[PDB]
Design an enzyme around this catalytic site. Sequence first.
Site, PDB file in Angstrom:
ATOM      1  N   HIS C 102       0.761  -1.237   0.000  1.00 11.98           N
ATOM      2  CA  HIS C 102       0.000   0.000   0.000  1.00 11.98           C
ATOM      3  C   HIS C 102       0.798   1.296   0.000  1.00 11.98           C
ATOM      4  CE1 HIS C 102      -4.548   0.744   0.856  1.00 11.98           C
ATOM      5  NE2 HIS C 102      -4.128   1.349  -0.240  1.00 11.98           N
ATOM      6  N   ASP C 125      -9.574  -0.942   3.846  1.00 13.69           N
ATOM      7  CA  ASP C 125      -8.414  -1.573   4.439  1.00 13.69           C
ATOM      8  C   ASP C 125      -8.692  -2.004   5.865  1.00 13.69           C
ATOM      9  OD1 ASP C 125      -5.774  -2.150   5.225  1.00 13.69           O
ATOM     10  OD2 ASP C 125      -5.017  -0.498   4.010  1.00 13.69           O
ATOM     11  N   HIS C 127      -6.271  -1.624   7.957  1.00 12.31           N
ATOM     12  CA  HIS C 127      -5.414  -0.644   8.623  1.00 12.31           C
ATOM     13  C   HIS C 127      -5.646   0.769   8.116  1.00 12.31           C
ATOM     14  CE1 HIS C 127      -3.479  -4.559   8.116  1.00 12.31           C
ATOM     15  NE2 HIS C 127      -3.042  -4.404   9.354  1.00 12.31           N
ATOM     16  N   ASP C 129      -3.201   3.011   7.723  1.00 10.02           N
ATOM     17  CA  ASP C 129      -2.037   3.442   6.943  1.00 10.02           C
ATOM     18  C   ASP C 129      -1.797   4.933   7.124  1.00 10.02           C
ATOM     19  OD1 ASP C 129      -1.922   0.871   5.995  1.00 10.02           O
ATOM     20  OD2 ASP C 129      -2.759   1.349   4.016  1.00 10.02           O
ATOM     21  N   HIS C 142       4.502   1.228   4.219  1.00  8.24           N
ATOM     22  CA  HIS C 142       3.180   0.922   3.693  1.00  8.24           C
ATOM     23  C   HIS C 142       2.117   1.255   4.741  1.00  8.24           C
ATOM     24  CE1 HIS C 142       3.658  -3.477   5.329  1.00  8.24           C
ATOM     25  NE2 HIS C 142       3.766  -2.556   6.269  1.00  8.24           N
ATOM     26  N   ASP C 231      -7.217  -2.381  -0.320  1.00 11.08           N
ATOM     27  CA  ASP C 231      -6.205  -3.262   0.241  1.00 11.08           C
ATOM     28  C   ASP C 231      -6.932  -4.592   0.396  1.00 11.08           C
ATOM     29  OD1 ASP C 231      -4.378  -4.688   1.896  1.00 11.08           O
ATOM     30  OD2 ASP C 231      -3.634  -2.785   2.699  1.00 11.08           O
ATOM     31  N   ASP C 233      -6.228  -7.074   2.123  1.00 11.21           N
ATOM     32  CA  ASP C 233      -6.173  -7.634   3.473  1.00 11.21           C
ATOM     33  C   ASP C 233      -7.405  -7.211   4.280  1.00 11.21           C
ATOM     34  OD1 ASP C 233      -3.803  -5.226   4.943  1.00 11.21           O
ATOM     35  OD2 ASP C 233      -5.928  -5.046   4.417  1.00 11.21           O
ATOM     36  N   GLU C 276      -1.512  -5.063  -1.819  1.00 14.78           N
ATOM     37  CA  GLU C 276      -1.234  -6.089  -0.828  1.00 14.78           C
ATOM     38  C   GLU C 276      -1.571  -7.481  -1.328  1.00 14.78           C
ATOM     39  OE1 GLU C 276      -0.294  -3.437   1.355  1.00 14.78           O
ATOM     40  OE2 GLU C 276       1.186  -5.046   1.534  1.00 14.78           O
TER      41      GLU C 276
HETATM   42  N1  LIG Z   1      -0.081  -1.260   6.007  1.00 12.03           N
HETATM   43  C1  LIG Z   1      -0.210  -2.056   7.234  1.00 12.03           C
HETATM   44  C2  LIG Z   1       0.062  -1.173   8.459  1.00 12.03           C
HETATM   45  C3  LIG Z   1       0.590  -2.057   9.606  1.00 12.03           C
HETATM   46  C4  LIG Z   1       1.077  -1.221  10.818  1.00 12.03           C
HETATM   47  N2  LIG Z   1       0.085  -0.190  11.185  1.00 12.03           N
HETATM   48  C5  LIG Z   1       2.429  -0.563  10.515  1.00 12.03           C
HETATM   49  O1  LIG Z   1       2.605   0.763  10.703  1.00 12.03           O
HETATM   50  O2  LIG Z   1       3.351  -1.234  10.110  1.00 12.03           O
HETATM   51 MN   LIG Z   2      -3.042  -0.779   3.568  1.00 10.03          MN
HETATM   52 MN   LIG Z   3      -3.729  -3.015   5.247  1.00 12.28          MN
END
Ligand SMILES: NCCC[C@H](N)C(=O)O
Ligand SMILES: [Mn+2]
Ligand SMILES: [Mn+2]
Lengths: 310, 310, 310
Positions: C102, C125, C127, C129, C142, C231, C233, C276
């Site tokens: 991402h 997503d 997350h 991000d 990402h 994403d 995921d 992803e």
């Molecule tokens: N793109 C996935 C994010 C995972 C986690 N918040 C990180 O900062 O690594």
């Molecule tokens: Mn993402």
């Molecule tokens: Mn994600």
Amino acid sequence: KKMSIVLAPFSGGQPHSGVELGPDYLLKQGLQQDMEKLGWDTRLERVFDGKVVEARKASDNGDRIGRVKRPRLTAECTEKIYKCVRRVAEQGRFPLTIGGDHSIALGTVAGVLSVHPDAGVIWVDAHADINTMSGTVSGNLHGCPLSILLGLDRENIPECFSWVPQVLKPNKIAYIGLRAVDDEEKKILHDLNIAAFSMHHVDRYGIDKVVSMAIEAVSPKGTEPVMVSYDVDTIDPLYVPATGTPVRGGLSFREALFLCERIAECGRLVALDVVECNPLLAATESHVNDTISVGCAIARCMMGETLLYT
Amino acid sequence: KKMSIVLAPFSGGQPHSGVELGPDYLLKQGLQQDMEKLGWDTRLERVFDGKVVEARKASDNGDRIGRVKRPRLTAECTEKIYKCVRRVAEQGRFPLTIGGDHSIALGTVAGVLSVHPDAGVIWVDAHADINTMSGTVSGNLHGCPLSILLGLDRENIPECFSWVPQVLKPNKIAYIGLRAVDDEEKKILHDLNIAAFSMHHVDRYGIDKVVSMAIEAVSPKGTEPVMVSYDVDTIDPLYVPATGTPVRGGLSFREALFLCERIAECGRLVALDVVECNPLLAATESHVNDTISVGCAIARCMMGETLLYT
Amino acid sequence: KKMSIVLAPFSGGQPHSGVELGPDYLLKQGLQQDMEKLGWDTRLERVFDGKVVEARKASDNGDRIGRVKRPRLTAECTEKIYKCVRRVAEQGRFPLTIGGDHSIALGTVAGVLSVHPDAGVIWVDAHADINTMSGTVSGNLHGCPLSILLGLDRENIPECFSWVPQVLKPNKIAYIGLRAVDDEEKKILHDLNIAAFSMHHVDRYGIDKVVSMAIEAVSPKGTEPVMVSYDVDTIDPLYVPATGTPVRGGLSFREALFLCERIAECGRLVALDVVECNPLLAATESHVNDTISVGCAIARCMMGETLLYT
Ligand SMILES: NCCC[C@H](N)C(=O)O
Ligand SMILES: [Mn+2]
Ligand SMILES: [Mn+2]
Ligand SMILES: NCCC[C@H](N)C(=O)O
Ligand SMILES: NCCC[C@H](N)C(=O)O
Ligand SMILES: [Mn+2]
Ligand SMILES: [Mn+2]
Ligand SMILES: [Mn+2]
Ligand SMILES: [Mn+2]
């Protein structure tokens, strides 16, 4: 914000081994650390040794009355839970009881209602756990808790259960997730007009609405204290591969958790039980890291853990 | 309350083996005992021997007309089903037909509508089963039932299908669970303005609403008789591991069963088919104990079995 | 109806290998053929070689600033994506960008908003991000795309990210499917009052309502251009066995796809990213034939593919 994590390693209503390890297993997942993090002054409370009890459980094979099994053993331990949970409550602490099969709810509910008389009870389970002493076909006491708390079939209830306070009324108990109700139990719920929400209602109305209904059901006035007794077998096996009593059409893990959030959101949760956690029964790795991982999740969510800022 | 369990071990529209064993397999799961329990005076009705038919099926490899396969064999057997189901209906019995692939619906629907002319038809399936003789790409007749009942592509329909009564009208057939419709079929449903509820509608509206809609669709007046033709492949593979035509996004087992309950709840179900049950196709144990365990469940629920008191 | 399929084989924000193969893998599933079929004049656009980049990725181990990893490499490649996507847009083509982790959204969003200033952004997503440079615990870029596009923690943003246009405003980005938000991120969304729809909202309201809300959130007037950054995921692991960052309670495959349909239905989709996608990470056959089969499905549905006639 004080909490007492009541450890009840009882496997009476349950056949042999497995469900007594839940308490320890949960604590290993960092259950207490999670509770502390959510801002709870947590204190453990061991009501008895699961190793000793488990021991006498196996040996003592003549604890019976009718088809009912382990009345003595089950009456002995549940009374200790009652007492413990009752004090915890009086001390103004939050009782978070970790089982152990659902027969421990005999001491939890009694304990909490003794101190909080007008408290409602949301029973999250795939089963009604309301078979009477004479009605029970299997004799497993984990399927008769409610019949005893509600005083059904008084005549046939053992002397060893005389310690049970009569604090629970039919209009103060609501079910959510039911899908394995025995014929006898179906008539009982109907006759006592108990608010029962089976999987039909969840499918028909969606979880959010059901929880709202269940909450309203045990709360004449939108202010009553609320207690949830959460059986992890309510969650569809796919999500609860490490338990011992599931069927076709349980709650999704999402629903199981959202339910908690709606409850935490309510703000009137006074006690909580998490039962039927059998790490052993499931020879996989995503199984044992479930009924205990699920248990902690339920606990965290019930206790306020949210997905976004709060 | 009389019922006739019509056994149709046909695997025509279906390639080779597997789907003919459904009838026997279901009966072994105690299907008749379940029906009797629900209070149905049940009587079996064998329309033909699946072993013999299966036999001629394999040998006779020259039964064709265009890409269409087994027109003769399929026309021969479905006519026997029609006749059987028609009598059962006239005798005032409830036709519960166990397949067998969905090509048997050619004789079931015809049979039921002959006696109950204003009956609506709810086709629970992942497919529309409405390809025409000249339109069918695969030639498998289990995907052309509806085109024949509705009289589409008359010109190209075989002489062996002259026995088919023209009792089904487009506004009397509603779909639920669609997600594998062929281009040809998409235009057909649209042009005939057939009430079709795909997985999109279930996702968008939830099952309860969809069933309500489907029921209203085939019931101008809220009193018409209703027939459901249930293809078990409608249920997402995860739930129907023992079938032979599923894709991405089917009904959950819960939805598949709740749907039945809403139908039973309606009180106007006049006939029921349960098809596409292939125990063999699935080399596991939770697979074979599904399309047959699912079939019985569908049957029990469709026939009134509830989760709570009734 | 011209489209440009932007191939971005970047695995920066991602640890080692796997996610760079997504572009090629998707194209092998016939992604371009599907797009052509849906009536899109499709043209591929390779922004760089995943094999070379992957190479320098491994060797170059000293690309860091704080806990942040690969700032140089990530700043170099995302700028090329920005430029590419920006032209594609100006040329009036539809940018369908295939990742890649991402972190590529840094160049996609910038690219699209440069040409379509008032465009809303729906971030599908698990997350957020949105970790800042100084906030990021893992340093994986990402998980910091949004913090850079929104200009958060300017002070600590590298010189190599000076090329990033400041076109994205907080009220123009909406989240759907969130369930793994870091504490830091929870406060950020709250403080900037970003429309965030976590799994709680999907469970509580159902997907249809959530999408409607997300769409309204980034569209003051019901006419604004819309961009989705998907994403994979977000989709529950059960459905996305071939990815690398899922948790408890993701979108079902049905929801993941219905969401697309609602978006396609809207008629204002201006750009789309699918990221992803790790075929490798998942040593099964139903795994590798998922994050790529899922990707194409998302693409097909987002681009108009429906279950019934259209
Ligand atoms: N793109 C996935 C994010 C995972 C986690 N918040 C990180 O900062 O690594
Ligand atoms: Mn993402
Ligand atoms: Mn994600
Ligand atoms: N707690 C599970 C109950 C199972 C069954 N109703 C029984 O009485 O054993
Ligand atoms: N009954 C399944 C139908 C499958 C496909 N539409 C066909 O015509 O073969
Ligand atoms: Mn229970
Ligand atoms: Mn239970
Ligand atoms: Mn069919
Ligand atoms: Mn079908």
